[PDB]
Amino acid sequence: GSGSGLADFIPNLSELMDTGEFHTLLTPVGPMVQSVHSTFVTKVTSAMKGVGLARDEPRAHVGLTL
Amino acid sequence: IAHGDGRRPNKQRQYIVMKACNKHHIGAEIELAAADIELLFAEKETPLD
């Protein structure tokens, strides 16, 4: 939306940016492998420690997209 | 060959020649896809496999 569909979960976005705590609260995880999507809840399987095996295409490798 | 002029006589000579090898190296690089090396081992399933 305009951005307030996400900002209601973090009411401290004004105050985490002042003192500078926002980098201490993110932990980098890695690229996606699979997302099984439902209506209210989305399941997401990501990959740490190396090249994650692709689910839908066999024998394949998921690379990172920026 | 000696001769009868006023030139100095000729002693017998000897020559010694040293030759050596020269090394050479060759290298070619092959790439092989990981799926190609894998499915040479995975089992037969169906006539399309």
UniProtKB/TrEMBL annotation, chain A:
<protein>
    <submittedName>
        <fullName>Core gene UL38 family protein</fullName>
    </submittedName>
</protein>
TrEMBL record, chain B:
<protein>
    <submittedName>
        <fullName>ORF25</fullName>
    </submittedName>
</protein>
